[PDB]
Design a protein around this ligand. Sequence first.
Ligand code: SF4
Ligand code: F3S
Length: 106
Amino acid sequence: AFVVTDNCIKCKYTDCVEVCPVDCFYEGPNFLVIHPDECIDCALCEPECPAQAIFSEDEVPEDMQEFIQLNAELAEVWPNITEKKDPLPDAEDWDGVKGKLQHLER
Ligand code: SF4
Ligand code: F3S
């Protein structure tokens, strides 16, 4: 699986969905996740994310490990998203701010 990590939050550019061949992204109000059983590890989404928030499971930074299970969990409850949309309105302001998990919306 690939995994969406902290920097997506309050950014949610959604560039990642457009290259995904198996449509395994799931949408929250201010974050996206990857369903780990559906992802085929094609890695195509990684360079597409302007927030640089996507990692191979086995490359998630130590300080963002909680994102692995959180993707798996939210992918069960959020709706599939398969089309790009506009980034969140103040994405640029939040791109690169650390610790945005505190802002994650369910
Ligand atoms: S690695 Fe490939 S299959 Fe998995 S989420 Fe990214 S684009 Fe989709
Ligand atoms: S910011 Fe989030 S919505 Fe996709 S393009 Fe990056 S993982």
